[PDB]
Amino acid sequence: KYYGNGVTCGKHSCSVDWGKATTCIINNGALAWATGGHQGNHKC
């Protein structure tokens, strides 16, 4: 949904453009922590 609209993910972490929300980063981080995965594997 947000990926591609100022939102992109790398290997272990995600990053957004200036002025964009970090909600995807937070959610992907939480999912990574819960599952023991990586933000680059999670989508948003």
Adjacent-strand bridge partners of 3: 7
Segments forming the whole domain that contains residue 42: 1-44
The residues with which 16 forms a beta bridge, in sequence order, are 7
CA distance 38 to 2: 18
Q: How many domains does the chain have?
A: 1
Which residue(s) pair with 15 in the sheet? 8
The gap between the terminal CA atoms of the chain, to the nearest Å, is 6
Tell me the sheet residues that pair with 9.
Answer: 14
Instruction: Pick left, alpha or beta for residue 13 (phi over 0 → left; psi -120 to 50 → alpha; otherwise beta).
Output: beta
Q: Say how far apart CA 9 and CA 28 lie, in whole Å.
A: 9
The DSSP letter of residue 22 is: -
- What is the rounded CA–CA span in Å between residue 4 and residue 37? 22
